[PDB]
């Protein structure tokens, strides 16, 4: 029978028949083991315990009542099959630990006692109870204790258990809070005392019905019911009423072997003996991260994927017996395809080292995927992006995109975790457009920040009295996609949750990211996620998320090593060469990029300055892209200066030599003012000295005055800031007045810097000690320009985005005429700058994030936000942000 | 080392010449009771007072043979507080006078009992002898609350007594009871008894407001067997075939054995399992059911027809083994069941316990009825050594040493800190060896897994060394008030002054109840070892890292070392991990040459046995230090292990809570593996 | 409670306290104050500036602490 | 003296905000602010009869504490009757089979809802807070409204408990879920979403073209079991009885297979 089953499973079979085949193989392997070993060791009596210990089945079809047709016996315990329909459930591998569990639990049930399979997590305790219940044909309910617990449901569930005669298993009883733990312990004590008195030796013939006290009423207790309490000690009430069992070490070497044999693998024993310790080392040798999972569930997922891969390979070979495959190669390829995407870049060589150690001489080849690889090349080229294959520049990022696409095929509910500064958003954007251009199906992505809006605004609220439901943002998007009023089906819809994750706003999400794919609204409506909608979680750290959400998502880890600095320089140079800052301007940009090309190399001036600036001390945590983007924006402003000088002099414009000198000097100035521009004077002087040491461009020759106090003039020569500061004579009535700002070397430097960084409209923050003069330099500089309005917002410790919304309502207006709703200031031609001092002051929530800061991040990176009035994306125009704050150490 | 510390006292400065000069000292060490005759060793110009003599001999007993420290503490108390100070405690508690007078009716009488014992019998037969009825009530049920309320109201109005049993299930209602009792109670003869088990959910205010009585099961196989036979009623024993009485006697013996091996927690049962009365009742029910099944009638049935396999399996996997988690305790329990529950148990030549007191044996009683077995039980001699249980006779000795250390800790727990904190911190900074650097992370020879495990080891070692040095420097700076003190430093100094190791310092597995001094000394040894590793790696590289006599106690995660050694052996000769098996060779040389697969280990300690030429032999002495241990990994030959080897466990510390790996040791031909299993022989990393 | 002093001490006014009907009542009382002093409607923002100047010249808030 | 004048002007100009509910009536919104204002005012008067200047204004303060006690006694039961009436309206209007199963309770609710709609119209005419207190017999009206809604809710709870007793697998579904099951017996499409919590592996039932006899059961993955003797819903119209025949016939057909 096993040979026939193994021959049949290798062929192509429908999934339900495949599951039936797998279950039959598992049971027949268990039967073969039992008969071969535990019965053939010189046993000849049917009453010997070596056979009575096994789970024996007796079928009597002459009995009239259906519940007594089949009797199930193990040891001295007798049960009647309840004949409950179970559909098709997962059948566990019957390891000797499972045999011991079955023996102990049936012994406890025979004595009308409870079962307590205590032990560590992931050892198979709840699954063992469920499998025992299904073997006897009993309905088994699992009461998860992960804060998804209540009294109103649980009491009536106990009543229903006692009435119908089903089984109740608690996933982890000790995790309940003390009061709930005590109350449920009281209820289980009552039910178990009812069960114990049911088998009273003097009252074996139960004439009066066995009844217990539940819900302050008398409830009949069925004798087929049982309560199972799974631990990780037992309450004093139930110590004498439950039989404990230690389920600590599951026999993984046997589970893996039987599962691989059921998958068609002929060398299941060797493959299991290699894969179990390999996962042990992966648990041990690899670094400890929250998202890693090397338990038995992940092991089963890997073996199932390996079986699917082997079957697909057999199908490919046939369409071109077939037994000579490299089984080890299939297993290692499956392990890599499942585990590599969620691995930190440091742990990748370690994973291949363990692979070489456990699996000697077998190598992994990734899928070429040339059909989509060319499309990715094209989309990267049209986005001025950097593209690469394998070891060349950009290989890691393209591989990461391929892993994201693979996991997108595998399952919905994506989660791309990567430190800020990695290629996360670009990866899925390029993937979306490449899929659109390849498969011909249009892709639409909705960007949602879950922290910019509240849970009630995100999911919808129910009126306290009216019972009217107004849908939230995510709910409205899902309803719009499902309704298909415009045709959002046959189109790849991606709901990307840009931001971070915490256990609050994902409470209603756990019901859809899993296999259920169902969103349950508290009004009663239920929404089913259509197959063409994928939900992604573009997060940064993944440090405040429950394991429940993490385990339900396929995951790609975007390490900072993925996005190399040469790639940033290539993107910047391509954008400068192609995207104008507004043809003569674009010609100027081409020239400037040509001069600055030798400096933006792998071991150029900028890279060495960057690697120095990291070891310095900065007031805020240095991020590579923050300083790089500041540097690029200042270079754009340089191109703007060159264009303005050319416009000022229509005859004799900027020549090649003068332009070269100016751009060289300004790039040095921009390295000084962008790298360590937020540090003390000593750090600035140290960076200036290092740059003087390394570079070859000429610098100011004065050995006393440092370069930070110098400037470059439009003529291409270093000039002092002291020469540009004017001498002012304020009136007597305005001596030391609130608004009087005396120009000084600092004031003029930061004035030019502020003009530079508001030319391209980056939000900036002057961070400094109290009394330095941020709040006054800012107002002077902003009010200097004539097309700028300034609104001063003072962020308190309780600041919320509602303040920003009120500011917008007071000063701006909503306009519908263009493609989308646009939020613009009421006055025309004036750019509204929002002063935000004490920007770091608003309090972080319980999960390490700032609501208003996330809101500003969404409005700055994406250019708009979602309004909660009618859930549409409003786009910002003619609005800027400016910040100021004291140092975080304060 | 103990006599080195003890000599620091001025009266003990010449202890060295004193111990060399005396020749009868050696026979004083192996004496059964050295506290009775302690030789005069202290040097003092003035004759020491009886009290001073007692103190000096007590210090000597702490130095030499600290196991008799409890007996010598008894002697010291007798010589200071007078003889027969604890004599009344040994006598049975007579709460007739205590209930009559000395206890006001307002104050409840609390009867706290160790889990697995009852206390209602003493108060019950006291009520029987004094002729005063009591309303016994169980508190487990909901109606028990108002039943107790009405009963105590009736008693206060009338003058009778009230019993409340197992009241530890309702802490809050105990608080309410205490509040209600705080009111004046009119009648003087009212007495309220609260039968209780020792449980810390019980409110403190009730404990302060009542008289506490602690009851414990008397120690001894005889007492436990009497309690078991008394609990089981006579009708259950003398029914059905007479072979049942012997079966229950066997089961009671097994219960008595595996309950008293609990008291020797690390040597004998690893952990403190429950093994309560519920397991006893379940085992009795199983025996009764299976004997009814196999023997339908009343007539006596042959011992070979007893379902022995059924009883052994159900008491090794379902009963008494459900709470057993680790493999070796299960192996011990199976050994005990196989030795006891067998058809050979029904002959007259059965030996329940062998090797008792060297040569004596506990002969199986030749009885058929319950009465003969009981009378055999009361005839057990009082001289019960641990050899009855299978443990070696020095198991009581290590237990007494543990109790002595616990008493010292308890005395310390119940005893201006600027200067002492400063001096201890300065000695610690002098003790710990500065800091080591990460002289690691080389691109070449990165395939070496030992090398990588040494990156990781040195990495977190230096991180936490820097952390502890920063904390110590900070507390030193705050000691002279040179800087501000924070909340983290508040917790840290509070933990240091209390003598408990800081939680932020324990980045590695630590024995339970470790004081800071030995933690920092162990830390110093680990850091010195890591500096040796780092210097060796710098001098030679990855190849020389293999030839290190590394000590697994000093490693934070020895199992990671074992795995890394497996990877190193497998990478050479192009082998896989599944095909490598561990073989242990014990060699006398501390610096013996290692071949391509041998790795040196130092500091492993063997308890209960001595190793010679890779052959084990049972020995009374414990902590037989192994000179050097080569771990070799060879290709598995796929052969069955012979019956002359044992799979010993290798724990990390003396508290056998964590397992590192297993060793296959060949034993001498005269012993058997079962005796090794029962005596708790094990290998310890530290 | 703090940092609301800081805004009215660095600049002399707290902009978050005055919105809607409260702001309108402030402007009406600023009318009354300007009329007592001798000024006219001018502009509402100019009235707010005069309010801020009067707060700067008149308000002296004292807050005490223990070392 | 001034405090009393602002209290006079705030309770003379206080307006009850009303919001439309399914184009049926205009219900009170703003319970929290009203309750907070009334509580703060009563606490402030309780502060003032304690003041030494209370003797000159003793009669006015007494009249005002009387009116505030009345206004709280009115709205504290008004919010309750609001909540119960909305609950009962939603459960007695969202389904059509609830009329048959509880006819007398349905008639009682129709009467009480007709009265409540009349009161809502009458209060919508003049939502001025005072104009709401001076209306004839408002207190006894709301008292009997609340009492009748309470007895109807208790009878409903007893009916659901009886329904649970008849079919013991209804205990697994919630009160709202069971109410939806019983009130929607005619249409089985919304029944099939509840089968995954009552039964073990059954996720749906396969019926006729007209949904008359239960052909069989289907699991979550599409695996189907065919009843040897299909059970007729038309012969056993009550939900519990034909569900019991479904479970029994499922057990019998599994036994035969
Ligand atoms: N150019 C300048 N002209 C006049 N006063 C100046 C100038 N630069 C600095 N000051 C003085 O320096 C102080 C700066 O005050 P302020 O603008 O509040 O700085 P601030 O640091 O942003 N305040 P804070 O938010 O608490 O840090 C005032 O006392 C000014 O008078
Ligand atoms: N090949 C590339 N792939 C991705 N980004 C690239 C590439 N070459 C250059 N870049 C630049 O690197 C940056 C990548 O930012 P991206 O939006 O992908 O990061 P993110 O992780 O989503 O953002 P955050 O920093 O907020 O976490 C952009 O500035 C982009 O222009
Ligand atoms: N005997 C077994 N055969 C096959 N798989 C098992 C077995 N025992 C446990 N598992 C697997 O282990 C996983 C987790 O088991 P679980 O019951 O969650 O453990 P715990 O109760 O400790 O959390 C399950 O997905 C199950 O598939
Ligand atoms: Mg689990
Ligand atoms: Mg992004
Ligand atoms: Mg400021």
| Residue A430 beta carbon below 6 angstroms from any ligand 2 atom | no
Rounded CA separation D31/A590 (Å): 67
- Residue B677 phi/psi, 5-degree rounding, is -65, -40
Residue whose pair of structure tokens reads 């690697």 in the numeric block: A611
**Which residues are near ligand 3 (CB < 6 Å)?**
A 92-93, 95, 98, 121-128, 230, 250, 255, 296-297, 300
- Residue D44 phi/psi, 5-degree rounding, is -70, -35
Structure-token pair, residue B36: 């009775």
Rounded CA separation A546/A148 (Å): 13
C42 Cβ partners below 8 Å, 6+ apart?
C34
Rounded CA separation D128/A367 (Å): 75
Strand partners, D28: D18
Q: Is B316 exposed, middle or buried (0-12, 13-18, 19+ CB in 10 A)?
A: buried
- The DSSP-derived string for chain D is -HHHHHHHHHHHS-B--EEEETTTEEEE--HHHHHHHHHHHHHHHHHHTTSGGGTTTHHHHHHHHHHHHHHHHHHHHHHHHHHHHHHHHHHHHS-STHHHHSHHHHHHHHHHHHHHHHHHHHHHH--BHHHHHSSTTHHHHHHHHHHHHHHHHHHHHHHHHHHHHHSGGGGGS-HHHHHHHHHT-S--TTTGGGHHHHSSSEEEEE--SSS-EEEEEEESSS-EEEEEEEEETTTS-SHHHHHHHHHHHHHHHHHH-
For residue B7, the 8-state DSSP code is T
**Gap from CA of A380 to ligand 2 centroid (Å):** 12
Query: Do the beta carbons of residue A500 and residue A847 sit within 8 Å?
Result: yes
Instruction: Give the 3-state secondary structure percentages of chain C, helix then strand then coil, rounded to 5.
Output: 65, 0, 35
Instruction: Spell out the SS3 assignment of D108-124.
Output: HHHHHHHHHHHHHHHHH
Distance from CA of A357 to the nearest CA of B (A): 6
A657 Cβ partners below 8 Å, 6+ apart?
none
**Cα angle A816, A822, A826; round to 5:** 95
- Residue B126 phi/psi, 5-degree rounding, is -65, -45
Rounded CA separation A126/A136 (Å): 16
Instruction: Locate the chain A residue with the closest alpha carbon to C13.
Output: A794
Structure-token pair, residue B430: 């002098």
Query: Do the beta carbons of residue B610 and residue B624 sit within 8 Å?
Result: yes
Query: Do the beta carbons of residue B662 and residue B648 sit within 8 Å?
Result: yes
Alpha-carbon distances, residue B148 vs A237, B142, B165, B181 (angstroms): 19, 10, 10, 13
Smallest CA-to-CA distance from A158 within A172, A138, A141, A171 is with A141
Residue ranges of E strands in B284-421: 351-356, 360-363
Rounded CA separation A537/A544 (Å): 13
Kind of pairing, strands B580-587 and B628-635?
antiparallel
Structure-token pair, residue B195: 């039968």
Strand partners, D232: D213
Query: Do the beta carbons of residue A883 and residue A839 sit within 8 Å?
Result: yes
Query: Do the beta carbons of residue B284 and residue B257 sit within 8 Å?
Result: no
Smallest CA-to-CA distance from A292 within A328, A338, A251 is with A338
For residue A886, the ligand closest to its alpha carbon is 1
Smallest CA-to-CA distance from B468 within B441, B503, B515 is with B503
Rounded CA separation B321/B334 (Å): 9
| Residue A425 beta carbon below 6 angstroms from any ligand 2 atom | yes
Query: Do the beta carbons of residue A534 and residue A414 sit within 8 Å?
Result: yes
End-to-end CA distance of chain B: 17
Structure-token pair, residue A548: 């429940």
Ligand 3, residue A129: give the atom nearest the CA: 17
3-state secondary structure of A792: strand
Query: Do the beta carbons of residue D174 and residue A154 sit within 8 Å?
Result: no
Rounded CA separation A419/A415 (Å): 13
- Give the DSSP H/E element, type plus range, for residue B311: helix B308-313
Residue whose pair of structure tokens reads 């520049």 in the numeric block: A393
Strand partners, A710: A720
Distance from CA of A124 to the nearest CA of D (A): 20
Alpha-carbon distances, residue B125 vs B92, B103, B121, B152, B162 (angstroms): 14, 19, 6, 20, 14
Instruction: Spell out the SS3 assignment of A510-541.
Output: HHHHCCCCEEECCCCCEEECCCCEEEECEECC
**Gap from CA of A352 to ligand 3 centroid (Å):** 28
Say how many C-beta atoms besides its own lie within 10 A of residue A653's C-beta. 16
Smallest CA-to-CA distance from A499 within A92, A845, A68 is with A845
Instruction: Locate the chain D residue with the closest alpha carbon to A15.
Output: D221
- Give the DSSP H/E element, type plus range, for residue B70: helix B69-81
Chain centre to alpha carbon of residue D185? 20
B427 Cβ partners below 8 Å, 6+ apart?
none
Solved with? cryo-EM
- The DSSP-derived string for A7-50 is HHHTS---HHHHHHHHHHHHHHHHHHHIIIIIITTT---TT-HH
For residue A69, the 8-state DSSP code is S
Instruction: Locate the chain A residue with the closest alpha carbon to B450.
Output: A285
Alpha-carbon distances, residue A732 vs A736, B413, C46 (angstroms): 9, 75, 22
Residues whose Cβ atom is located within 5 A of ion ligand 5: A 425
Rounded CA separation B521/A227 (Å): 51
B238 Cβ partners below 8 Å, 6+ apart?
B245, B369, B370
For residue A427, the ligand closest to its alpha carbon is 2
Rounded CA separation B184/A651 (Å): 111
What resolution in Å is listed for this PDB structure?
Answer: 3.4
Structure-token pair, residue A10: 């290798």
Instruction: Locate the chain A residue with the closest alpha carbon to D251.
Output: A83
In A272-311, the residues whose Cβ lies within 8 Å of chain B are 273-274, 277-278, 280-281, 284-285
- Give the DSSP H/E element, type plus range, for residue B624: strand B624-625
Size (chain B), residues = 686
In A501-530, the residues whose Cβ lies within 8 Å of chain D are 524, 526
B45 Cβ partners below 8 Å, 6+ apart?
none
B309 Cβ partners below 8 Å, 6+ apart?
A48, A49, A50
Q: Is B621 exposed, middle or buried (0-12, 13-18, 19+ CB in 10 A)?
A: exposed
Rounded CA separation B45/B42 (Å): 10
The CA-based diameter of chain A, rounded to the nearest angstrom, is 119
Ligand 2, residue A422: give the atom nearest the CA: 21
Which residues from D are below 8 Å from A85, CB to CB? Answer: 199-202, 217, 219, 225, 250, 254
Say how many C-beta atoms besides its own lie within 10 A of residue D237's C-beta. 13
Alpha-carbon distances, residue A247 vs A20, A284, B275, B572 (angstroms): 28, 21, 18, 37
| Residue A774 beta carbon below 6 angstroms from any ligand 1 atom | yes
**Gap from CA of C13 to ligand 2 centroid (Å):** 42
Query: Do the beta carbons of residue A475 and residue A460 sit within 8 Å?
Result: yes
Residues A379-389 as b/e (b if ≥16 CB within 10 A, e otherwise) read bbeebbbbbbe
Query: Do the beta carbons of residue A267 and residue A256 sit within 8 Å?
Result: no
Rounded CA separation B433/B428 (Å): 10
List all chains that touch chain C, counting a touch as 3 or more CB pairs closer than 8 Å.
A
Smallest CA-to-CA distance from B389 within B244, B486, B269 is with B269
Q: Is A438 exposed, middle or buried (0-12, 13-18, 19+ CB in 10 A)?
A: middle
D40 Cβ partners below 8 Å, 6+ apart?
none
Residues D202-226 as b/e (b if ≥16 CB within 10 A, e otherwise) read bbbbebeeeeebbbbbbbeeebebe
Alpha-carbon distances, residue A188 vs A217, B470, B624 (angstroms): 15, 52, 51
Q: Is the dihedral of CA D210, D215, D217, D223 positive or negative?
A: negative
Distance from CA of B91 to the nearest CA of A (A): 32
Choose among A104, A278, A353: nearest Cβ to B317.
A104
Rounded CA separation A143/A75 (Å): 29
- Residue A485 phi/psi, 5-degree rounding, is -65, -30
D126 Cβ partners below 8 Å, 6+ apart?
D132
Q: Taking phi first (over 0 means left), then psi (-120 to 50 degrees means alpha), and beta for anything else, what does residue B521 get? A: alpha
Rounded CA separation D255/D142 (Å): 58
CA torsion, ordered A298, A302, A304, A308, to nearest 10 deg: 150
Residue whose pair of structure tokens reads 């597995």 in the numeric block: B509
């Amino acid at each position: 029978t096993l040979n026939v089953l193994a021959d049949s499973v290798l062929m192509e079979q429908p999934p339900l028949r495949r599951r039936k085949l797998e279950h039959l193989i598992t049971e027949l392997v268990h039967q073969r083991d039992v008969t071969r070993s535990l019965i053939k060791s010189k046993i000849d009596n049917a009453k010997s315990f070596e056979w009575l210990s096994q789970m024996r089945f007796y079928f009597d079809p002459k009995q009239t009542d259906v519940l007594q047709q089949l009797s199930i016996q193990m040891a001295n315990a007798k049960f009647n099959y309840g004949f409950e329909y179970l559909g098709v459930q997962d059948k566990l591998v019957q390891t000797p630990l499972t045999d011991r569990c079955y023996l102990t639990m049936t012994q406890a049930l025979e004595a009308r006692l409870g079962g307590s399979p205590f032990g560590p997590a992931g050892t198979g305790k709840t699954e063992s109870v469920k499998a025992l219940g299904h073997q006897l044909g009993r309905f088994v309910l699992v009461f998860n204790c992960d804060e998804t617990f209540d009294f109103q449901a649980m009491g009536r569930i106990f009543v229903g258990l006692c009435q119908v005669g089903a089984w109740g298993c608690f996933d982890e009883f000790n995790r309940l809070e003390e009061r709930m733990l005590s109350a449920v312990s009281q209820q289980v004590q009552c039910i178990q005392e009812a069960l114990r008195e049911h088998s009273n030796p003097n009252y074996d013939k139960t004439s009066a019905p066995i009844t217990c006290e539940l819900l302050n009423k008398q409830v009949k207790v069925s004798p087929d019911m049982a309560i199972f309490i799974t631990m990780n000690n037992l309450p004093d009430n139930l110590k004498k009423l439950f039989r404990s069992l230690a389920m600590t070490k599951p026999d993984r070497q046997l589970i893996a072997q039987v599962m691989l044999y059921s998958q068609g693998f002929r060398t299941a024993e060797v493959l299991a003996n290699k894969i179990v310790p390999f996962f042990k080392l992966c648990d041990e040798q690899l670094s400890s991260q929250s998202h890693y999972d090397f338990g038995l569930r992940a092991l089963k997922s890997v073996l199932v994927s390996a079986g699917n891969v082997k079957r697909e390979r057999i199908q490919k070979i046939k369409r071109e017996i077939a037994e000579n495959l490299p089984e080890q190669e299939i297993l290692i390829q499956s392990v890599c395809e499942t585990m590599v995407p969620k691995l930190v870049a440091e742990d990748i060589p370690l994973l291949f080292s363990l692979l070489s150690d456990v699996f000697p001489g077998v190598q992994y080849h990734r899928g070429e995927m040339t059909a989509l690889r060319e499309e990715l090349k094209k989309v990267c080229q049209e986005m001025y992006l950097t593209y690469g294959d394998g070891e060349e520049v950009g290989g890691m990022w393209v591989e990461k995109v391929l892993q994201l696409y693979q996991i997108t095929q595998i399952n919905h509910g994506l989660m791309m975790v990567g430190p800020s500064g990695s290629g996360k958003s670009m990866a899925w954007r390029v993937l979306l457009k490449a899929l659109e251009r390849l498969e011909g199906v249009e892709g639409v992505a909705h960007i949602i920040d879950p922290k910019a809006i509240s849970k009630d605004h995100l999911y919808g609220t129910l009126d306290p009295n009216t019972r009217e439901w107004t849908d939230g943002l995510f709910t409205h998007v899902l309803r719009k996609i499902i309704d298909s009023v415009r045709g959002e089906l046959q189109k790849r819809q991606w709901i990307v949750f840009d931001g971070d994750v915490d256990p609050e706003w994902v409470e209603n999400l756990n019901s859809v990211l899993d296999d259920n794919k169902l969103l349950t609204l508290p009004n009663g409506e239920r929404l089913s996620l259509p197959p063409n909608v994928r939900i992604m979680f573009e997060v940064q750290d993944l440090k405040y998320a429950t394991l429940a959400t993490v385990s339900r998502c396929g995951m790609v880890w975007f390490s900072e090593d993925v996005l190399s600095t040469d790639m940033i320089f290539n993107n910047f140079l391509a954008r400068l060469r192609s995207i104008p800052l507004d043809s003569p301007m674009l010609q100027i940009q081409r020239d400037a990029a040509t001069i600055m090309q030798p400096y933006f190399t792998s071991n150029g001036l900028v890279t060495k300055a960057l690697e120095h600036a990291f070891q310095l001390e900065h007031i805020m945590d240095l991020t590579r892209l923050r300083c790089l983007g500041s540097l690029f924006s200042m270079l754009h402003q340089a191109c703007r200066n060159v264009a303005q000088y050319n416009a000022n002099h229509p005859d004799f414009p900027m020549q090649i030599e003068q332009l070269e000198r100016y751009i060289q000097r300004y790039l040095v100035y921009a390295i000084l003012w962008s790298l360590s521009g937020d540090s003390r004077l000593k750090m600035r002087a140290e960076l200036g000295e290092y740059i003087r040491r390394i570079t070859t461009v000429p610098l100011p020759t004065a050995p006393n005055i440092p370069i930070i106090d110098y400037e470059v003039s439009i003529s291409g020569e270093w000039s002092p800031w002291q020469a540009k500061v004017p001498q002012i004579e304020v009136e007597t009535h305005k001596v030391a007045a609130p608004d009087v700002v005396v120009p000084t070397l600092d004031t003029v430097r930061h004035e030019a810097l502020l003009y530079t960084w508001l030319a391209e409209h980056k939000p900036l923050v002057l961070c400094g000690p109290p009394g330095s003069g941020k709040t006054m330099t800012l107002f002077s500089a902003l009010r200097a320009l004539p097309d700028m309005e300034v609104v001063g917002l003072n962020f308190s410790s309780a600041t919320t985005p509602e303040l920003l919304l009120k500011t917008f309502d007071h000063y701006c207006e909503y306009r519908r005429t263009p493609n989308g709703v646009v939020l613009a200031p009421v006055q025309l031609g004036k750019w509204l700058v929002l002063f935000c001092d004490e920007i770091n002051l608003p309090d972080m929530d319980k999960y390490g994030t700032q609501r208003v800061i996330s809101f500003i991040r969404q409005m700055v990176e994406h250019g708009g936000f979602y309004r909660t009035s009618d859930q549409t994306w409003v786009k910002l125009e003619r609005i800027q942000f400016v910040g100021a704050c004291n140092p975080p150490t304060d | 080392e103990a006599v080195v510390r003890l000599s620091c006292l001025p009266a003990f400065k010449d202890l060295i010449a004193k111990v060399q000069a005396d020749e009868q000292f050696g026979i004083w060490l192996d004496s059964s009771s050295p506290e009775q005759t302690v030789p005069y060793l202290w040097s003092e110009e003035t004759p020491a007072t009886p009290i001073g003599q007692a103190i000096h001999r007590l210090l000597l007993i702490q130095a030499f043979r600290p196991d008799r420290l409890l007996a010598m503490a008894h002697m010291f108390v007798s010589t200071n507080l007078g003889e027969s100070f604890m004599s009344i405690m040994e006598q049975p508690l007579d709460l007739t006078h205590i209930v009559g007078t000395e206890v006001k009716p307002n104050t409840p009488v609390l009867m706290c009992s160790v889990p697995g014992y009852d206390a209602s019998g003493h108060v019950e037969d006291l009520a029987a002898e004094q002729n005063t009825q009591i309303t016994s009530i169980a508190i487990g049920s909901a109606e028990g609350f108002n039943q107790a309320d009405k009963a105590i109201n009736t008693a206060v109005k009338s003058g009778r007594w009230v019993m409340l049993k197992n009241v530890h299930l309702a802490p809050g209602w105990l608080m309410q009871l205490e509040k209600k009792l705080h009111s004046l109670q009119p009648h003087a003869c009212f007495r309220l008894f609260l039968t209780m088990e020792i449980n810390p959910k019980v409110p403190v205010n009730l404990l302060r407001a009542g008289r506490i009585f602690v009851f414990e099961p008397p120690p001894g196989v005889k007492a436990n067997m009497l309690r078991t036979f008394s609990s089981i009623p006579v009708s259950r024993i003398c029914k059905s075939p007479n072979e049942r009485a012997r079966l229950y006697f066997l089961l009671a013996w097994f219960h008595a054995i595996i309950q008293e091996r609990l008291r020797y927690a690390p040597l004998g049962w690893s952990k403190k399992y429950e093994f309560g009365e519920s397991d006893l009742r379940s085992a009795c029910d199983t025996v009764d059911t299976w004997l009814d099944d196999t023997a339908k009638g009343r007539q006596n049935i042959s011992p070979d027809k007893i379902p022995w396999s059924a009883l052994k399996t159900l008491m090794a996997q379902s009963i008494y083994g459900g709470r057993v988690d680790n493999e070796f305790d299960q192996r011990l329990l199976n050994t005990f069941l196989e030795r006891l529950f067998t058809t050979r148990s029904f002959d007259s030549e059965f030996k329940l316990a062998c090797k008792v007191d060297g040569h004596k044996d506990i002969q199986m009683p030749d009885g058929i009825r319950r009465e003969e077995f009981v009378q055999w039980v009361e005839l057990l001699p009082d001289t019960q050594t641990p050899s009855w249980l299978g443990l070696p006779n020095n198991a009581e000795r290590v237990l007494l040493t543990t109790q002595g250390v616990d008493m010292i800790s308890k005395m310390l727990k119940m005893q201006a800190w600027m200067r002492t904190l400063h001096t201890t911190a300065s000695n610690w900074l002098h003790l710990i060896p500065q800091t080591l650097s990460h002289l690691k992370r080389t691109v070449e020879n990165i395939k070496d897994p030992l090398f990588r495990f040494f990156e990781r080891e040195v990495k977190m070692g230096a991180k936490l060394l820097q952390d502890v040095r920063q904390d110590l420097a900070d507390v030193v700076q705050v000691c002279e008030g040179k800087k501000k003190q924070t909340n983290y430093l508040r917790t840290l100094i509070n933990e240091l002054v209390k003598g408990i190791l800081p939680r932020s310092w324990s980045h590695y597995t630590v024995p339970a109840g470790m004081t800071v001094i030995q933690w920092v000394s162990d830390f110093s040894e680990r850091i010195k070892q890591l500096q040796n590793i780092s210097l060796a790696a710098a001098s030679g590289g990855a190849k020389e890292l293999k030839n290190i006599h590394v000590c697994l106690g000093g490693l934070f995660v020895p199992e990671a070392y074992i795995t890394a050694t497996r990877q190193y052996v497998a990478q050479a000769n192009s082998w896989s991990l599944e095909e490598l098996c561990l073989e242990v060779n014990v060699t006398t040389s501390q610096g013996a040459t290692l071949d391509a697969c041998s790795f040196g280990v130092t500091g492993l300690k063997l308890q209960g046995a001595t190793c010679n030429n890779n052959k084990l032999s049972l020995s009374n002495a414990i902590s037989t230090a192994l000179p050097l241990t080569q771990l070799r990994w060879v290709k598995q030959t796929n052969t069955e292990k012979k019956a002359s080897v044992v799979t010993l466990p290798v724990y990390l510390n003396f508290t056998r809570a964590d397992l590192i790996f297993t060793v296959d040791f060949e034993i001498a031909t005269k012993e058997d593996p079962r005796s090794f299993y029962e005596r708790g022989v094990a290998v310890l990393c530290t | 409670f703090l940092e609301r002093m800081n805004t009215l001490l660095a600049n002399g006014e707290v902009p978050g306290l005055f919105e809607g009907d409260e702001y309108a009542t402030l402007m009406t009382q600023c009318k009354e104050g300007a009329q007592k002093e001798g000024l006219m409607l001018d502009s509402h923002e100019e009235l707010y500036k005069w309010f801020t100047s009067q707060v700067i010249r008149n308000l002296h808030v004292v807050f005490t602490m223990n070392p | 003296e001034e405090f009393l004048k602002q209290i006079r002007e705030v309770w003379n100009t206080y307006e009850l905000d009303l919001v439309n509910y399914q184009n049926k009536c205009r219900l009170i919104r703003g319970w929290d602010d009203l309750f907070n204002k009334v509580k703060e005012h009563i606490n402030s008067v309780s502060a003032m009869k304690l003041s030494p200047y209370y003797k000159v204004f003793e009669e006015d303060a007494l009249s005002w504490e009387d009116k505030l006690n009345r206004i709280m006694a009115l709205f504290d039961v008004w919010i309750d009757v609001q909540r119960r009436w909305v609950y009962l309206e939603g459960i007695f209007t969202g389904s059509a089979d609830i009329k048959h199963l509880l006819p007398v309770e349905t008639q009682r609710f129709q009467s009480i809802s007709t009265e409540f709609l009349a009161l809502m119209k009458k209060v919508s005419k003049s939502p001025l807070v005072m104009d709401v207190l001076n209306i004839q017999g408002v207190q006894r009206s709301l008292e009997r409204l609340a009492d009748l809604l309470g007895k109807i809710q208790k009878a409903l709870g007893e009916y659901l408990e009886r329904e649970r007793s008849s079919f013991p697998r209804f205990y697994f579904v919630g009160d709202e879920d069971l109410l939806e099951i019983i009130g929607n017996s005619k249409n089985v499409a919304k029944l099939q979403k509840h089968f995954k919590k009552m039964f073990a592996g059954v996720s749906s039932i396969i019926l006729n073209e007209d949904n008359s006899v239960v052909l069989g059961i289907s699991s979550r993955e599409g695996e189907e079991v065919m009843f040897k003797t299909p059970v007729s819903i038309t012969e056993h119209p009550k939900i519990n009885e034909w569900l019991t025949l479904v479970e029994k016939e499922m057990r019998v057909t599994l036994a035969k297979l």
